[PDB]
């Protein structure tokens, strides 16, 4: 019945969105800005107990990562593994979130130079607390995100030129690209 | 199983009522002139056919054509090979659950609908007899696909000793049937609370297709089976009707029986038709004798000349009714709608007058621009009815100028430019500038600027408000008899059966009398109207010198000749006479004076 | 419950309430109470040519196994009857219960002193088209009376429910008097064969217990000039328990009033249970009748 | 397990053995009556909602649906002893749940809320139609038996497997075609209705999957509220956003009620209960056979307005109405009665129109600006990419028996007035702009609250000088109720003492005791309060049809026509064939409230002495002479 | 028939993808008018957007268009025949004979 | 589907390589023969079709001998064979409500 989180706040230095490249991976960097175009409230998973119905589907598996639709590690008996999964709704706690876009403040914009932006996932009790339309600060953990090219119906720029190196994993040959995004933990709105 | 077959080949060669031997006496009559079709009749078919339908209700979708294989085997008995298969047409009538009980107990049972058909698609083809080749092993077979569960009743297998799916569809020895996907619409009267109507889809067979035009009352009887298109949640399918037989009402292409026309000729010799209709057309209208005669001539019309040159005359008349509120110009117009063969009713606000005649839009398949919609193309041969000719100034006048007077439109939108035919007949009922002031001032102020529409219509009534103390009290005596008591519904039913004509008899003889005779006026009348006009123009000519302007021009003079041709369609005489034509001007001479006062 | 094998378990709903008019109501409880026993099956359009023709034998059995357990408990024995039937080989089964019903209505409709002649020439003529109804040669005229009959009851019940709710039946002392002064559709009361049926419906509204004053009524109606007023009397009825000799008392009194003054009274109609009266004579009619106790 | 078998036994007695409120067997009444219509519905009474909830709330939120599946099979055997043989007739019942204590809306849905009972509102946007659902999957093997029984399929999850209990091979499970019953399935997507919402922002979207006997109850455009559960079934495939550990919500509904109004209640008017059987119907007869009712009722309608009589009488007549009566193959007859209020800026004309909106069953309140000519009646909303030009209604086709407003939108007067005076004249109007040529049905009622340019007596000159409307659109109405006051001492206190006392009108026993306080506070003079008064109106409009006589009708023909003569020889605006059709109609509206189907003599003179004075008093200075005329009419 | 949708002398870039990879400037109304005659009605009962098109095709024999594709000068030899009506009834004699329709004098 | 009559086994191929030898295949294109292919839709002569419908249409595949002969707007009169092609009902599975019998005219 107990689920927690870690909420730091009030680091000294506050940056802008144009200063986030190299040292900022796995760091903690407070970021200002203004917010526009929220979205709705859907649930996430972080842990399941799905398993195949081969003999017994009561294996609480691990690793609910960004492609988590395959619990296939350490089956219970000597049975058939990775043959199925049944994501029950009855035993795995969820946590609720929303995806929002931010934007740079008006007292810093050098010229009218198509002011760039990025996106951010907020996942704890931070839900529905960023009212859209205020000068807002954030927690700071930076994160990269892929697309694993799941079993769905699909699998200008030279994008993914980096990703041509990312070929030849043990699953199928493709190009897994990347994009810098943001995970938060704690909001504030001074203003 | 089989053997059902033996229960019916030993059943339709002997069913009869008392010594008429009917089904051989019509199948013999139906193999001769090529139709290849049946019907069924009454109760014992029902009496033991339920005892067959208690083994046919389980699947009336595969053993309905187990009837069909039988009657071919009785057909060759009446021949002695070119023999097609047949089709079935049914009949049943108890009531009409309109569109309510449609998923629970009505999958694959016999249903009866009442609807208004609106939209026809172009024809297509599916096969019924094929020939099949294995590829590298060259087997030859033939499969027949008769009735359906839309496509894929059975498939083609893998067995020929050649490779997998080696089968191909030649086109050398094949037959074909056509389907429709015409759309059905609910009759807009049966379920009012606050809702909007819905719609279904259906197909048919060739010897019952192309039997409906859009804009009619219809009834239909058939199955409620289910297909599944893969172009939305769980695996859900859609509904459609497989129809069997349209025992419709009339077409509302001039073939019918003979006893209908026997009474018509027996009525048309009694020369009281012109006065007896004016009482019998509108059983709910106090008098209004000048207006009432204008409607019966409007419904039938004149003719059409394609005379040996290039041009043509326009054989039609178009009336107007303008006057004070409370003079029954409105509710008279619903009355012409049911009695017409083809009628629409778009009477309000123009309804986007550019999109009255034509519409084009993008397409879900192939992204194309083709022609779909119109108010006029639906309404050919008949009569439209609109109103409010004061507060439409946008496009209503620029849309009817071409649509009238030549009746030949061509859309020049992004796709085609085609001159589609039109033979329409219009009707309108507007308001003047609040009525009384247009009858208490200078006689102008009717249309805001232009009179050019008014020259395009010939007949104009201008009603008014009197105060005659004896004609109102009769009217106040009239409408309480027709409101409650419904005693005149018992009175007019009592003078019906020997003297008057109901509504369903008027409709059927108008389409007969129009589509048979072709009048022409006599050259003795040529001296009559010529002597008439020269003082009519002079009566106008004496008025202009008194600084009185406005409108009469020569369309009306070629409109009176259509008016005198109209009652010649009524009497069905191939000439026109002088007691014919003197009563005709007596309608229009009356409407010349009110054009001045 | 009649004409079922010909048709309409729909318009049975009216004359099922006729049967509940034989019980304790005319509209109120039944328009709830009928909806235990009837809309159990929605009544179709195509297979209703087969279900209330054929597999209503599963349901006639079911009423046969409904009313056997409505027998020691309800005990209302106006429904089960032995009856008689005939067939033609084909063309449906037609019994004789409904068959007399078509002959009555088809005799009705199917068409100084100047109006009575053109009224009397009608009833002889429309009689004549019923006499030839006994061949096989009349088929598509046989159903004409059938579809005529199942509106005439709907016509006659339309006004019977009116004169109840008007509450103009007055038990004065002996009988009850009702004068239908004016309603709608007065034309269907010139020919007297409808009037005994209207009484036949009206004698059964008062066929409750009524353990005193079992006396039938006398009605009144007028359509034509000079107040012809084809007044008539009925018979009292028994709820299936004739022990007492109750034929009629009125014809004895009908000799009396006709013998008094001859001031425009008429007995020209054939059956003695119907006479005529003048408008100013019907009020001294009853005053002569409320004292002349001849039962 | 097996202890739930006792649970079904334990609740069954806990239901039917008790009836609250002095007995009279309430729960036994709901069951037998919705047997008699055969319509598959039950309820939960409010006062023993909570006592049926208290020992069952921990068995609500723990499992809301499997408790219901075992809740359903006891209701078969509940009625089976009462009505037998509900097996050959559709063999199926499922329960419903009444109102629930919960306020919240779409903004507040957490992970703690799921798999539980939820109540939420919104507006129904664009919907689909009705399809059949399989619901009983007969599975088909190829080699072994192709009949695996009609299954219990889920919602939109597409439950299947590879191989079980026949073999272990890849012979796929297929279909065949016999004895699989079908229910229906109608997916309405839902937008949040922009009422109780912190404004200036966007709507939010959800999904509703209806069930079998809950099809097409709502219409595309009203506001509703649902009492569903919160099932979150999806595989984890989504394509507007990328693939993620994310789940989507689906609200499977359990019941549905309509537009609610005046959300202030505590123990009543939360459900349209509307069941009038043993106690209510016995009562409704004896309230109808009294000799002063229509004098008492119209005094009892507007509770808080001390005004003159006739406006209450007409607005009593408007929502009662006559008959859309049938006719043969000829013209139909208007079955609606439409009134018009002329007033002064400062009397209470804006409130009686407000008050009737609650007391009617259905309504709409299109007022002021924005009333576009296409916007009231039907419009054609354009298609999305693979769609077609469909037909979406506006105001009137929703409001079958309601209210609009046209006072004086002076600029937009010429825009839409050519669309409402053909709703009465050409009654049942629809149109064909750029689409299909159909015609819907709308037997709507119009009231209006027009406003003269300045004061009420802007002139001694007549009504065509006073209002800016012209004649024909004005002539569709029945009566121009007009107000007036200059100076009156005793009449003013009769308002002034009246209005100040209204501002003085600012736990099972206590829930009852507040109600008697709520009952006494309306009962200062006890004018038959609104707890029962609206409830018999709804079947005073859907169960009784009046008819007429002949011998008393022709006495008013000269009373019409000689008044037609004096009004034509002396007239501002004329009466026509129109007005007399309203004369007989507002007569029979009164006798419709005697619940009696007949027309008397006591009403026609009452109906006349409403119209004639209310016509003549609007004329001029020359009105004192006409009052010497009308007592001859009386 | 002089119904004046944009298409009286142009293409409006209607290609219909011409089997996945072919874009065609489909001929509206000038491939029929070449070395022939046309006739159109109701000049004053038209919008503005046709009048700018009849300006170009009269001063110049050709139209040239680049809507979402190719500039192309295709040739045309046309000859219009006109039909319009005066505005204010029979007002021609009591006023100026000119401006009597008052459509732009670019065409007159 | 151009021989107009015989439904032969098709060759689902564009160009072969490496016949049964070790020689790299070369192709002579001057001695390879070609032909053209043009579809055109024909409306209805909108005077003799009676007034109950819009004009319908079908299509026709012709060959080189009378291409560029058909200006849009010509009273044409063609004659050819009536012909169906295409697999209706098997080339996809379950095939519900999809016609697979296209009307064609391979004419002269
Ligand atoms: N001459 C007449 N004979 C019989 N009935 C009439 C006549 N004139 C009007 N009525 C009656 O008027 C009733 C209602 O018509 P209504 O008042 O809608 O006319 P209206 O549409 O107002 O007239 P207008 O079209 O001039 O505005 C109808 O039931 C019709 O029977
Ligand atoms: N006779 C009355 N009894 C009780 N309250 C009244 C009375 N007359 C006016 N009021 C009060 O005056 C307030 C002002 O609203 P009012 O009814 O005057 O608007 P109105 O002038 O009718 O508006 P509109 O002119 O737009 O219809 C109302 O809230 C109402 O409570």
Note down, in words, how this protein is organized:
Chain C: Assembles into a complex with MCM5/CDC46. Interacts with MCM10. Chain C: Belongs to the CDC45 family. The structure is cut from a larger assembly and holds one copy of chain A (about 190 residues), one copy of chain B (about 600 residues), one copy of chain C (about 300 residues), one copy of chain D (about 625 residues) and two copies of chain E (about 110 residues). Chain A is mainly β and about 190 residues long. Chain A contains no helices and eight strands. The two termini of chain A are about 35 Å apart. Chain B has about 600 residues and is of the alpha+beta class. Chain B has a domain at about 260-595: P-loop containing nucleotide triphosphate hydrolases (Rossmann fold, 3-Layer(aba) Sandwich), CATH 3.40.50.300. In chain B, about 30% of the residues lie in helices and about 15% in strands. In chain B, strands 1-7-8-12-9 form a five-stranded mixed beta barrel. Chain B has a four-stranded parallel beta sheet with strand order 16-19-13-20, covered by helices on one side. Chain B has a three-stranded antiparallel beta sheet with strand order 4-3-5, with no helix packed on it. In chain B, helix 14 (about 555-570) packs across helix 15. The longest helix of chain B has 19 residues, at about 525-545. A two-stranded antiparallel ribbon of chain E has the order 1-2. The chains are: A mainly beta (about 190), B alpha+beta (about 600), C alpha+beta (about 300), D mainly alpha (about 625), E little secondary structure (about 110). At the B-D interface, strand 11, helix 8 and helix 10 of B face strand 2, strand 3, helix 10, helix 16 and helix 17 of D. The complex binds adenosine-5'-triphosphate (2 copies). One adenosine-5'-triphosphate (ATP) sits at the interface of chains B and D. The site of one adenosine-5'-triphosphate (ATP) has 14 residues of chain D, from helix 8 and helix 13.
CATH homologous superfamily identity of the domain at 258-596 in chain B: P-loop containing nucleotide triphosphate hydrolases
Radius of gyration of chain A: 20 Å
Question: What is the class of the domain at 258-596 in chain B in the CATH system?
Answer: Alpha Beta
From the structure provided, what is the oligomeric state, counting identical versus distinct chains?
A: part of a larger assembly
Helix/sheet category of chain B:
alpha+beta
**What is the global morphology of chain B?**
elongated
CATH topology of the largest domain in chain A: OB fold (Dihydrolipoamide Acetyltransferase, E2P)
The largest β sheet of chain B comes out as: 5 strands, mixed, barrel
CATH topology of the domain at 258-596 in chain B: Rossmann fold
Helix count of chain B equals 15
Q: What are the secondary-structure elements of chain A, in order, as H or E?
A: EEEEEEEE
Number of DSSP strand runs of chain B: 20
């Amino acid at each position: 019945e107990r689920v927690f989180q870690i909420s730091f706040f009030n680091l000294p230095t506050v940056h802008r969105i144009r200063d986030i490249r190299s040292e900022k991976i796995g760091s903690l960097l407070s970021i200002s800005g203004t917010v526009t175009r929220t979205s709705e409230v859907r649930p996430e998973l972080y842990k399941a107990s799905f398993t195949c119905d081969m003999c017994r589907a009561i294996v609480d598996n691990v690793e609910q990562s960004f492609k988590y639709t395959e619990p296939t590690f350490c089956p219970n008996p000597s049975c058939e593994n990775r043959a199925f999964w049944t994501l029950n709704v009855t035993r795995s706690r969820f946590l609720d979130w929303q995806k929002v876009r931010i934007q740079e403040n008006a007292n810093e914009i050098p010229t009218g130079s198509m002011p760039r932006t990025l996106d951010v996932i907020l996942r704890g009790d931070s839900v529905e607390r960023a009212k859209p339309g205020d000068r807002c600060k954030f927690t700071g953990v930076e994160i990269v995100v892929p697309d694993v090219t799941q079993l769905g119906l699909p699998g200008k720029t030279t994008e993914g030129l980096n990703s041509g190196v990312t070929g030849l994993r043990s699953l199928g040959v493709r190009d897994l690209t990347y994009k810098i995004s943001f995970l938060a933990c704690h909001v504030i709105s001074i203003g | 199983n089989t053997e059902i077959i033996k229960s019916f080949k030993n059943f339709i060669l002997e069913f009869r009522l008392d010594s008429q031997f009917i089904y051989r006496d019509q199948l013999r009559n139906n193999i001769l002139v090529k139709n290849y079709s049946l019907t069924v009749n009454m109760e014992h078919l029902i009496g033991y056919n339920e005892d067959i339908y208690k083994k046919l209700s389980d699947e009336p979708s595969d053993i309905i054509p187990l009837f069909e294989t039988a009657i071919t085997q009785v057909a060759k008995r009446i021949s002695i090979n070119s023999l097609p298969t047949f089709q079935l047409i049914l009949n049943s009538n108890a009531n009409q659950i309109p569109l309510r009980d449609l998923d629970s107990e009505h999958v694959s049972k016999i249903v009866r609908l009442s609807g208004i058909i609106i939209s026809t698609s172009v024809l297509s083809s599916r096969a019924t007899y094929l020939s099949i080749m294995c590829r590298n092993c060259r087997h030859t077979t033939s499969i027949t696909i008769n009735n359906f569960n839309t496509g894929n009743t059975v498939s083609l297998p893998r067995s020929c000793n050649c490779g997998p799916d080696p089968y191909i569809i030649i086109h050398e020895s094949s037959k074909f049937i056509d389907q429709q996907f015409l759309k059905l619409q609910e009759i807009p009267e049966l379920v009012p609370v606050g809702e909007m109507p819905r719609n279904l889809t259906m197909t048919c067979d060739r010897y019952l297709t192309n039997k409906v035009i859009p804009g009619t009352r219809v009834t239909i009887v058939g199955i409620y089976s289910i297909y599944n298109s893969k172009n939305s949640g769980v695996a859900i399918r859609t509904p459609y009707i497989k129809i069997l037989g349209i025992q419709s009402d009339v077409e509302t292409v001039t073939m019918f029986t003979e006893e209908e026309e026997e009474e018509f000729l027996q009525l048309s010799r009694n020369p009281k038709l012109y006065e007896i209709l004016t009482n019998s057309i509108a059983p709910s209208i106090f008098g209004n004798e000048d207006i009432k005669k204008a409607i019966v001539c409007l419904l039938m019309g004149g003719s059409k000349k394609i005379l040996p040159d290039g041009m043509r005359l326009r054989g039609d008349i178009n009336v107007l009714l303008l006057g004070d509120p409370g003079t029954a110009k409105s509710q008279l117009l619903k009355f012409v709608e049911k009695v017409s063969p083809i009628a629409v009713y778009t009477s309000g606000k123009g309804s986007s007058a550019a999109g009255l005649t034509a519409s084009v839009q993008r397409d879900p398949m192939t992204r194309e621009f083709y022609l779909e919609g119109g108010a006029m193309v639906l309404a050919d041969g008949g009569v439209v009815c609109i109103d409010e000719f004061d507060k439409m100034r946008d496009e209503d006048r620029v849309a009817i100028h071409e649509a009238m007077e030549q009746q030949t439109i061509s859309i020049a939108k992004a796709g085609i430019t085609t001159v589609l035919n039109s033979r329409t007949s219009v009707l309108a009922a507007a308001n003047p500038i609040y009525g009384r002031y247009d009858d208490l001032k200078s006689p102008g102020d009717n249309i805001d600027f232009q009179t050019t529409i008014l020259s395009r219509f010939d007949m104009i009534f201008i009603v008014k408000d009197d105060h005659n103390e004896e004609r109102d009290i009769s009217i106040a005596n009239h409408v309480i008899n027709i409101h409650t008591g419904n005693a005149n519904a018992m009175q007019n039913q009592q003078e019906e059966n020997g003297s008057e004509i109901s509504i369903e008899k008027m409709k059927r003889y108008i389409t007969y009398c129009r589509l048979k005779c072709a009048p022409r006026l006599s050259p003795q009348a040529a001296e009559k109207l010529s002597s008439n006009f020269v003082t009519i123009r002079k009566q106008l000519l004496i008025n202009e010198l008194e600084s009185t302007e406005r409108p009469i021009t020569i369309r009306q003079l070629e409109a009176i000749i259509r008016i005198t041709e109209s009652l010649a369609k009524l009497e069905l005489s191939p000439i026109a006479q002088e007691r014919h034509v003197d009563e005709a001007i007596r309608l229009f001479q009356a409407s010349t004076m009110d054009a001045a006062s | 419950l009649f004409l079922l094998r010909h048709s309409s378990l729909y318009d049975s709903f009216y004359y099922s309430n006729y049967v509940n008019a034989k019980l304790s109501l005319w509209n109120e409880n039944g328009k709830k109470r009928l909806h235990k026993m009837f809309a159990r099956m929605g009544i179709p359009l195509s297979t209703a040519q087969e279900t209330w023709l054929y597999m209503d034998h599963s349901i006639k059995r079911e009423l046969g196994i409904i009313f056997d357990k409505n027998l020691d408990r309800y005990g209302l024995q106006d429904i089960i009857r032995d009856g008689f039937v005939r067939t033609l080989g084909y063309r449906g089964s037609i019994s004789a219960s409904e068959f007399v019903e078509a002959l009555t209505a088809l005799l009705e409709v199917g068409n100084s002193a100047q109006k009575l002649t053109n009224l009397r020439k009608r009833w002889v003529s429309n009689f004549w088209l019923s006499w030839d109804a006994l061949d096989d040669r009349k088929v598509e005229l046989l159903n004409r009376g059938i579809q005529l009959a199942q509106d005439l009851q709907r016509a006659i019940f339309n006004t019977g429910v009116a004169i109840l709710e008007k509450k103009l039946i007055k038990h004065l002392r002996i009988y009850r008097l009702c004068v239908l002064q004016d309603g709608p559709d007065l034309d269907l009361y010139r020919n007297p064969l409808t009037l005994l049926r209207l009484g036949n419906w009206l004698i059964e509204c008062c066929a409750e217990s009524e353990d005193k004053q079992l006396l039938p009524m006398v009605l009144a109606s007028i359509d034509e000039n000079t107040d012809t007023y084809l007044v008539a009397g009925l018979t009292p009825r028994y709820p299936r328990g004739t022990k007492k000799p109750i034929l009629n008392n009125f014809s004895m009194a009908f000799q009396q009033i006709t013998a008094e003054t001859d001031a425009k009274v008429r007995i020209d109609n054939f059956e003695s249970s119907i006479i005529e009266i003048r408008r100013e004579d019907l009020s001294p009619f009853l005053e002569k009748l409320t004292l002349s106790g001849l039962l | 397990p097996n202890v739930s078998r006792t649970i079904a036994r334990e609740l069954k007695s806990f239901l039917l053995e008790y009836t609250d409120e002095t007995g009279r067997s309430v729960y036994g009444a709901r069951i037998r009556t919705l047997g008699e219509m055969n319509s598959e519905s039950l309820e939960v009474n409010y006062r023993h909602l909570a006592e049926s909830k208290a020992i069952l709330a921990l068995f609500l939120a723990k499992c809301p649906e499997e408790m219901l599946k075992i809740f359903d099979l006891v209701a078969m055997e509940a009625t089976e002893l009462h009505y037998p043989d509900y097996a050959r007739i559709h063999s199926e019942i499922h329960v419903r749940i009444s109102d629930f204590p919960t306020i919240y809306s779409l903004r507040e849905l957490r992970e703690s809320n799921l798999s539980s009972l939820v109540r939420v509102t919104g507006v129904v946007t664009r919907r689909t139609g009705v399809f059949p659902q399989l619901k009983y999957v007969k599975f088909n093997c190829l080699k072994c038996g192709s009949i695996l029984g009609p299954f219990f399929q889920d919602s939109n999850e597409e439950i299947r497997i590879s191989f079980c209990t026949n073999c272990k091979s890849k012979g796929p499970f297929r279909v065949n075609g016999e004895k699989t019953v079908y229910r229906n399935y109608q997916r309405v997507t839902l937008q949040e209705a922009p009422g109780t919402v912190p404004p200036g922002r966007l709507p939010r979207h959800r999904e509703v999957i209806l069930l079998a006997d809950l099809v097409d109850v709502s219409k595309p455009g009203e506001e509703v509220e649902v009492t569903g559960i919160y099932k979150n079934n999806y595989d984890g495939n989504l394509n507007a956003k990328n693939g993620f550990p994310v789940f989507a919500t689906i609200i499977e509904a359990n019941s549905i009620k309509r537009r609610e109004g005046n959300t202030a209640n505590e123990g009543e008017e939360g459900l349209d209960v509307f069941s009038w059987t043993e106690e209510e119907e016995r009562e409704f007869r004896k309230i109808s056979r009294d000799r002063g009712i229509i004098d008492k009722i119209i005094s009892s309608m507007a509770p808080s307005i001390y005004g003159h009589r006739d406006i209450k009488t007409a607005v009593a007549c408007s929502l009662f109405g006559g008959v859309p009566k049938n006719v043969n193959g000829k013209h139909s007859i208007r079955g609606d009665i439409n009134v018009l209020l002329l007033g002064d800026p400062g009397t209470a004309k804006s409130q009686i129109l407000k008050y009737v909106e609650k007391t009617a069953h259905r309504a709409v309140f299109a007022t002021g600006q924005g009333a576009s000519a296409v916007g009231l009646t039907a419009s054609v909303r354009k298609d999305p990419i693979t769609k077609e030009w469909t037909l979406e209604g506006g105001a009137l086709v929703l409001a079958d028996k309601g209210v609009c407003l046209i006072d004086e939108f002076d600029k937009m007067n010429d825009q839409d007035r050519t669309s409402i005076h053909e709703a009465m004249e050409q009654q049942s109007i629809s149109i064909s702009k750029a689409g299909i040529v159909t015609t819907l049905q709308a037997r709507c009622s119009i009231i209006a609250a027009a406003n003269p340019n300045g004061g009420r007596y802007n002139s001694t000159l007549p009504l065509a000088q006073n209002v800016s409307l012209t004649e024909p659109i004005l002539s569709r109405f029945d009566i121009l109720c007009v107000v007036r006051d200059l100076v009156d001492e005793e009449a003013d206190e009769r308002l002034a003492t009246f209005v100040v006392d209204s501002h003085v009108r600012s736990q099972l026993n206590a829930r009852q005791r507040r109600l008697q306080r709520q009952r006494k506070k309306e009962e200062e003079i006890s004018p038959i309060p609104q707890e029962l008064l609206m409830k018999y109106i709804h079947y005073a409009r859907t169960k009784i049809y009046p008819k007429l006589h002949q011998m008393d009708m022709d006495k008013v023909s000269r009373v019409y026509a000689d008044l037609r003569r004096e009004s034509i020889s002396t007239g501002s605006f004329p009466i026509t064939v129109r007005h007399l059709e309203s004369i007989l109609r507002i007569a029979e509206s009164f006798a419709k409230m005697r619940l009696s189907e007949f027309v008397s003599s006591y009403d026609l003179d009452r109906a006349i002495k409403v119209v004639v004075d209310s016509f003549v008093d609007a004329q001029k200075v020359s009105v004192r002479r006409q009052l010497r005329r009308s007592f001859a009419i009386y | 028939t002089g119904r004046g949708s944009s298409g009286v002398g142009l293409t409006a870039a209607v290609t219909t993808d011409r089997e996945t990879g072919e874009r065609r400037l489909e001929a509206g109304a000038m491939v029929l008018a070449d070395r022939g005659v046309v006739c159109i009605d109701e000049f004053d009962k038209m919008t503005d957007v046709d009048r700018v098109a009849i300006h170009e095709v009269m001063e110049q024999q050709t139209v040239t268009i680049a809507k979402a594709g190719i500039h192309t000068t295709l040739n045309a030899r046309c000859s219009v025949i006109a039909a319009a009506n005066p505005v204010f009834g029979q007002y021609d004699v009591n006023r100026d004979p000119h401006q009597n329709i008052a459509l732009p004098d670019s065409l007159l | 589907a151009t021989t107009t009559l015989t439904t032969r086994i098709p060759t689902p191929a564009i160009y072969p390589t490496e016949d049964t030898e070790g020689n790299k295949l070369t192709t002579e294109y001057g001695y390879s023969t070609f032909i053209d292919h043009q579809r055109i839709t024909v409306q209805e002569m909108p005077e003799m079709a009676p007034a109950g419908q819009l004009p319908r249409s079908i299509d026709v595949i012709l060959d080189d001998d009378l291409v560029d002969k058909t200006k849009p707007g010509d009273r044409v009169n063609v004659v050819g064979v009536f012909k169906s092609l295409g697999a209706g009902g098997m080339n996809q599975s379950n095939s519900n409500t999809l016609i697979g019998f296209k009307t064609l005219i391979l004419g002269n």
